[PDB]
Design a protein around this ligand. Structure first.
Ligand SMILES: [Co+2]
Ligand SMILES: [Co+2]
Ligand SMILES: [Co+2]
Ligand code: NA
Ligand code: NA
Length: 282
């Protein structure tokens, strides 16, 4: 299997006029980064809806993962599920991003742009979808196998899912936020994998990335304590190879320097009064 290069992007996909755009659409930056980390009851309920819809679109696009399919095609299916359910694709026009989801094959760490790239037998494909509806965002991603994937790669994917679910299960009020990354990195290290550091989870609510940062590696200097009503993502990227990376000229696509493959899963989580709720549960 060759190292990837860019395909050709289809033209901007339309979303009907009636679907409210986030404020940042058609602007070079977003107005985000200083929003309250604890959401209102109202926002939380809205986030369950956005979460559910983001989960639906992910599951639909992942069902189309198969050798022969293009990445562009995955984006088409996600885009259509979001639009049919009344949601704007949060990534579309977010800091100039040109598509409705991120499609990250093989050695693409994250931020892959759906294009003419055709998926081949044995590939792994992460699809990261976000839904904006009722003034709020819901954010989820998963890596999907295409055809006969090598054992090495199935285990990576399975272990990355497990790391994510284990991190989720430690979410509870009064526990330090740093616990998440300690659990993730312990689990990756157990199988000789390396956890990506420069890319993180994030707080999410009425904004996409609200200023809260969730690290996926062990960093006990973070003193943040989880509180009921806080909403954030856990989205670890886990590398078979070294951490070093490059960004394509498209300004988005992050690829491992050594071209070894990498995997990721993501959910949007709520800290409840006693534990956690997965808002992007299928
Ligand atoms: Co990202
Ligand atoms: Co995401
Ligand atoms: Co996210
Ligand atoms: Na949500
Ligand atoms: Na990854």
């Amino acid at each position: 299997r060759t190292a990837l290069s860019p395909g050709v992007l289809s033209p901007t996909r339309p979303v009907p006029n009636w679907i409210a755009r986030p404020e940042y659409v058609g602007k070079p930056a977003a107005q985000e980064g200083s929003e309250p980390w604890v959401q209102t009851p109202e926002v939380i309920e809205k986030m369950r809806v956005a979460g559910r819809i983001a989960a639906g679109a992910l599951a639909e696009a992942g069902k189309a993962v198969a050798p022969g399919v293009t990445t562009d095609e995955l984006d088409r299916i996600a885009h259509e599920y979001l639009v049919d359910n009344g949601a704007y694709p949060s990534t579309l026009g977010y800091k100039g991003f040109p598509k409705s989801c991120c499609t990250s094959l093989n050695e693409v760490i994250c931020h892959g742009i759906p294009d003419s790239t055709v998926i081949t037998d044995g590939d792994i494909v992460n699809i990261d979808v976000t839904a904006y509806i009722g003034g709020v965002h819901g954010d989820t991603n998963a890596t999907f196998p295409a055809g006969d994937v090598a054992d090495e790669h199935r285990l990576l994917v399975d272990r990355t899912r497990e790391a994510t679910m284990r991190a989720i299960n430690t979410v509870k009020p009064g526990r330090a936020l740093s616990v998440i990354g300690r659990v993730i990195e312990s689990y990756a290290n157990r199988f000789g994998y390396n956890v990506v550091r420069d890319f993180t989870g994030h707080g999410i609510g009425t904004t996409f990335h609200n200023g809260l940062v969730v690290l996926h590696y062990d960093q006990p200097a973070v003193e943040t304590i989880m509180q009921p009503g806080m909403t954030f993502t856990i989205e670890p990227m886990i590398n078979l190879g070294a951490l070093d990376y490059e960004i394509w000229d498209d300004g988005w696509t992050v690829v491992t320097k050594d071209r070894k493959w990498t995997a990721q899963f993501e959910h949007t989580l709520l800290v409840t009064d006693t534990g956690v709720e997965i808002l992007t549960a299928l």
